């Protein structure tokens, strides 16, 4: 079976930036390898053939090159909806093989969250459990601490997180932060607060409410 | 136009057996070779199945024996019959083109390939866990909104499984400034998500937000409205 390993696994790039992506084969492949690029809840597209030939209504900026076992694919100048997950692919062998896959982020300038709290509805409060969900709104670097403070006591294990995938066109990231509480300890407290950390905030960002007003 | 719709993708028992389908048009189905390729949530692409234009089949070590891959030329139709199924076989299954590319400058002529034609996919589960219907929640946006400012409102889709569920706003009238959240799988092994929207403050009265979930997998259709308390 031939293995493809895909160097390296996670980069951050510019717009205008040149992006260098390889794929090395365990076994000599000649120049049966293709690239595809995979956008976010989409399924890969096809962009380089026998390693070098660009695909129909692919841009110019992609390009590949190499032969035998190494193999590179060339982004000249970047654009933000070049962000995706970038997968090599050999059909040298019958027993077709992927590699691991590229994650491509486009850096961009730092953008401040916007910081939203949101109380648990009076109809989940009905059913025994809490759910007090804190926004992380359009912001950039990707890297953020999220905070719960009940009764400004810190708070552990009782939270979960989802980000969305880097926004196609001003390469923003949105988070989620949801803390799980049953109606007997939410209605025990009075403060509800989310505390944000992050590099385009010049301190933490603190959203909170009181229960019941 | 060229397209491939997969069906037949849902929640299974493990040890059970599942049958894929996929329709192809816009192209001479006989004349390609195909493929089923799949891909669990957060992992990468993993070769499922090959079939020539003859019916000629491959498979990797980690199908080999279970599944089956067929074809149906006069119903431009692709199969694939998954059976004895356990967890490592969930993902989104995709049904896909193999396309042929003749590189001819000389010496020497060879022909070349690509997967150029991918479905959107359909997702396979196997688990032993119950279909369960989600319950749906307002985010209703805060009193404290800065007049000419921009408010945040949304919906909580809590406690389901399997996924998919799709959330719209408005019928599909309200895209901008959209934001659903990737499910997080919770620690009682059901499914969350939050739909979030930032609008105009002073849209708060006058525009009506509802929420359209939906969650096939259990026949679960809710429109929620959300308003401020």
């Known amino acids: 079976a031939i293995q493809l390993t895909q160097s390296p696994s996670s980069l951050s790039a510019s717009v205008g930036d040149r992006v260098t992506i390889t794929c090395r084969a365990s076994?000599?492949?000649?120049?049966?390898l293709a690239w595809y690029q995979q956008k976010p809840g989409k399924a890969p597209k096809l962009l380089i053939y026998?390693?070098?030939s660009l695909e129909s209504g692919v841009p110019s900026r992609f390009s590949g090159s190499g032969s035998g076992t190494d193999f590179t694919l060339t982004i000249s100048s970047l654009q933000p909806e070049d962000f995706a997950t970038y997968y090599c692919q050999q059909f040298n062998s019958y027993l077709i093989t992927f590699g691991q896959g590229t994650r491509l982020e486009i850096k961009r300038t730092v953008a401040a969250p916007s910081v939203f709290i949101f109380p648990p509805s009076d109809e989940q409060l009905k059913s025994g459990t809490a759910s007090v969900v804190c926004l992380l709104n359009n912001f950039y670097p990707r890297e953020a601490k999220v905070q719960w403070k009940v009764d400004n006591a810190l708070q552990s294990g009782n939270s979960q997180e989802s980000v969305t995938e880097q926004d196609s066109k001003d390469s923003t990231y949105s988070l989620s932060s949801t803390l799980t509480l049953s109606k007997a300890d939410y209605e025990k407290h009075k403060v509800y607060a989310c505390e944000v950390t992050h590099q385009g905030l010049s301190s933490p960002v603190t959203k909170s409410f009181n229960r019941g007003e | 136009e060229v397209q491939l719709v997969e069906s037949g993708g849902g929640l299974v028992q493990p040890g059970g057996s599942l049958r894929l389908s996929c329709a192809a048009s816009?192209?001479?189905?006989?004349?390609?070779?195909m493929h089923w390729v799949r891909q669990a949530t957060g992992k990468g692409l993993e070769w499922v199945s090959a079939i020539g234009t003859a019916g000629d089949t491959y498979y990797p070590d980690s199908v080999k024996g279970r599944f089956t891959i067929s074809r149906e030329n006069a119903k431009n139709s692709l199969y694939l019959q998954m059976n004895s199924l356990r967890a490592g076989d969930t993902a989104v299954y995709y049904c896909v083109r193999e396309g042929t590319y003749y590189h001819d400058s000389g010496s020497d002529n060879y022909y070349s390939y690509g997967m150029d034609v991918w479905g959107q996919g359909t997702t396979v589960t196997v688990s032993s866990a119950s279909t369960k219907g989600p319950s749906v929640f307002p985010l209703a946006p805060s009193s404290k909104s800065t007049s000419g400012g921009t408010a945040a409102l949304g919906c909580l889709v809590k406690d389901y499984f399997p996924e998919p569920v799709t959330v719209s706003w408005n019928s599909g009238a309200l895209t901008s400034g959209v934001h659903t959240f990737p499910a997080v799988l919770q620690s009682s092994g059901l499914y969350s998500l939050s739909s979030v929207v930032t609008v105009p403050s002073s849209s708060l009265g006058t525009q009506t937000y509802i929420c359209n979930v939906n969650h096939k997998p259990s026949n679960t259709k809710v429109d929620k409205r959300v308003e401020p308390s």
């Open positions: 076994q000599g492949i000649s120049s049966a």
């Open positions: 026998d390693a070098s």
């Open positions: 816009g192209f001479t189905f006989s004349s390609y070779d």
